[PDB]
């Protein structure tokens, strides 16, 4: 996250870190045994880390649970990034508490102008690289479809939305992918892609979770 703030320990209780020897992506806990992330975060050997603040220090609220299965969306296209969503099942259910909690799926799609919370452990620099150890947060509005398409001609599908600031300076970045965009207490987006980070006229692009609620519910119900 570039241009954000320190969230505070466990103030984003649905945020997970995906670890394969190291943090590589975020995710969102949506019930005691399932996480939503980005399809482009797929790999084998995932351990889900819940209750994290500093990802390099055991602070006492973590739960580390290996994945039993991952399910990439059937229509994910890694070239276009359309349908950039996957589900990860935990081998055992997380113990839910105030610091490890699921986030509700949306009942409706959020509109341009809605203010949301984006979070992650990604790079905090638009030029160069610095990672944080603690979770970072950014408040940002959803942008209109027309301004998103104007920013990225020929690239924005009906399964994507932009959020952030056309002036630049505040954005998601490398290592935030797969993490949450939460608006009014519902998971509306997944950190997906952009052109660099925090550049002028290049806001972050996010998977539009409301389009996937049926797929998520039906997949969970049979897996
Ligand atoms: C205490 C604060 N609560 C809110 O911001 C609620 C309201 C909220 O999410 C948003 C308002 C505008 C965009 S998003 C908080 C908690 C955790 C992390 N950072 C801040
Ligand atoms: C630049 C960064 N990531 C991407 O644009 C997608 C990266 C991508 O598809 C892949 C990486 C490895 C295999 S596939 C980003 C993230 C969030 C906001 N702004 C920029
Ligand atoms: Ca930790």
Descriptive terms for the model:
six-stranded antiparallel β-barrel; Peptidase_S1A; Thrombin, subunit H; 223 residues; binds calcium ion; seven-stranded antiparallel beta sheet; serpin family protein binding; binds the ligand C[C@H](NC(=O)CCC(=O)c1cccs1)c1cccnc1; Peptidase_S1_PA_chymotrypsin; 2 domains; EC 3.4.21.4; mainly beta
Note down, in words, how this protein is organized.
With 223 residues, this protein is mostly beta strands. It has two domains: 5-7 and 103-211, Trypsin-like serine proteases (Thrombin, subunit H, Beta Barrel), CATH 2.40.10.10; 15-102 and 212-222, Trypsin-like serine proteases (Thrombin, subunit H), CATH 2.40.10. 8% of the residues lie in helices and 32% in strands. It is built from two helices and 13 strands. It has helices spanning 145-151, 213-222; strands spanning 5-6, 15-19, 23-31, 34-37, 47-50, 63-72, 86-90, 115-120, 136-141, 160-163, 180-183, 186-193, 204-208. The strands form two sheets. It has a seven-stranded antiparallel beta sheet with strand order 1-9-8-11-12-13-10. Strands 2-3-4-7-6-5 form a six-stranded antiparallel barrel. Strand 3 (23-31) and strand 4 (34-37) form a beta hairpin. The chain starts with a strand and ends with a helix. Bound molecules: the ligand C[C@H](NC(=O)CCC(=O)c1cccs1)c1cccnc1 (2 copies) and calcium ion. One copy of the ligand C[C@H](NC(=O)CCC(=O)c1cccs1)c1cccnc1 binds next to strand 8 and strand 9.
